[PDB]
Design a protein around this ligand. Structure first.
Ligand SMILES: [Ba+2]
Ligand SMILES: [Ba+2]
Ligand SMILES: [Ba+2]
Ligand SMILES: [Ba+2]
Length: 362
């Protein structure tokens, strides 16, 4: 179709900017999911990117952890409005922290991500990450305003574990991946995934990587302008804040079912997507968030989903509630700085795709 060719052209144009590769899944109302790729999964072996290549979805994990939590609310064992002192009696300020603030980025919790060594072999514990966060991050007052919080999601994972007596991967697998037939999806902290199937991630030695967001000491020298950063960072370190591995295909499966009401009941779905306040994420298109979902604006279209940044894999997922479209675009180029083209520029092909869909519909 004309749309197919337009979208493929958009992806080709983006890799021609110097992005190594890109993998997209797009489902449109009344249609099957279409997959599109451009560029390479492996820069040095020149392996073509396919729709079967696995990616670290980074913070897109947060939407699944939110879903897991909202499901335990459905089971009647968790109340979104009850204090987390029940699970974390000694966590500073926990009495002023309802369950919902763990998901909505207004907890004021100290964060770990900017302090955590990215290049290491360290197997992290959830409690260890929380401890690490309080040691090195700055705590604000609950409800101070919106500041993106990874710690809130690590804590959410700990509730899931405590209320199910098992790792949070079990709950997510049994309640989300299995019933939806997501066969190429893993939870990195608690599951082994086939590394050989994963697209390589590339950090670029770019001029606009001025203010890096991660401690990337120990990187060595760049080869052909990049570092292979695929296996730099322990997924256990990201934990419930960003440890998942998946394919665009599988992510669109999840998104379709979530917004079709086949995972969460109507109240819990509303909590996730519609009970929103303003939200900011540097370099992104984010304008608002609910309880597991970011609202990201692309001119006259909007996605309800999430962004993901983990060294070398840069992801945008979401559903356009107006048009009914669901997408996951992941590139295997990144940088450290939020404002780098290699990070923030992932929003450009997403923007173009949505306007191509819109024009095909005019
Ligand atoms: Ba600097
Ligand atoms: Ba390592
Ligand atoms: Ba509009
Ligand atoms: Ba037209």
């Amino acid at each position: 179709s004309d749309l197919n060719n337009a979208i493929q052209g958009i992806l080709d144009d983006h890799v021609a900017r110097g992005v190594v590769g890109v993998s997209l899944a797009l489902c449109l109302p009344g249609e099957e999911t279409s997959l599109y790729q451009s560029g390479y999964a492996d820069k040095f072996n020149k392996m073509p990117m396919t729709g079967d290549h696995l990616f670290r979805i980074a913070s897109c994990t947060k939407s699944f952890i939110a879903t897991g939590l909202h499901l335990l609310v459905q089971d009647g064992t968790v109340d979104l409005d009850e204090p987390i002192t029940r699970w974390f009696p000694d966590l500073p300020k926990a009495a002023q922290m309802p369950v919902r603030i763990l998901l909505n980025h207004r907890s004021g919790l100290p964060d770990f991500e900017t302090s955590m060594p990215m290049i290491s072999d360290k197997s992290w514990t959830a409690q260890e990450i929380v401890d690490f966060s309080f040691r090195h991050g700055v705590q604000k007052e609950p409800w101070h305003g919106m500041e993106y919080s990874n710690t809130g999601y690590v804590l959410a994972g700990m509730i899931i574990a405590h209320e199910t007596g098992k790792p949070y991967s079990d709950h997510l697998r049994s309640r989300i991946f299995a019933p939806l037939g997501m066969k190429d999806t893993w939870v990195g902290t608690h599951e082994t995934f086939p590394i050989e199937r994963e697209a390589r991630g590339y950090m670029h030695a770019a001029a606009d990587d001025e203010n890096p967001q991660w401690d990337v000491s120990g990187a060595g020298d760049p080869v052909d302008g990049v570092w292979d950063s695929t296996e730099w960072f322990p997924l256990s370190g990201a934990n419930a804040a960003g440890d998942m591995v998946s394919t665009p295909r599988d992510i669109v499966k999840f998104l379709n079912a979530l917004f079709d009401g086949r995972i969460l009941d109507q109240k819990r779905l509303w909590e996730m997507k519609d009970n929103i306040k303003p939200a900011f994420f540097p370099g992104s298109n984010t304008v608002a968030n609910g309880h597991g979902l970011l609202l990201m604006r692309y001119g006259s279209s909007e996605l309800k989903g999430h962004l993901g940044q983990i060294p070398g894999h840069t992801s945008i997922m979401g559903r356009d509630e107006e048009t009914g479209a669901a997408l996951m675009l992941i590139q295997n180029s990144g940088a450290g700085d939020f404002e780098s083209f290699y990070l923030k520029g992932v929003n450009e092909p997403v923007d173009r795709v949505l306007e191509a869909i819109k024009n095909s519909r005019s």
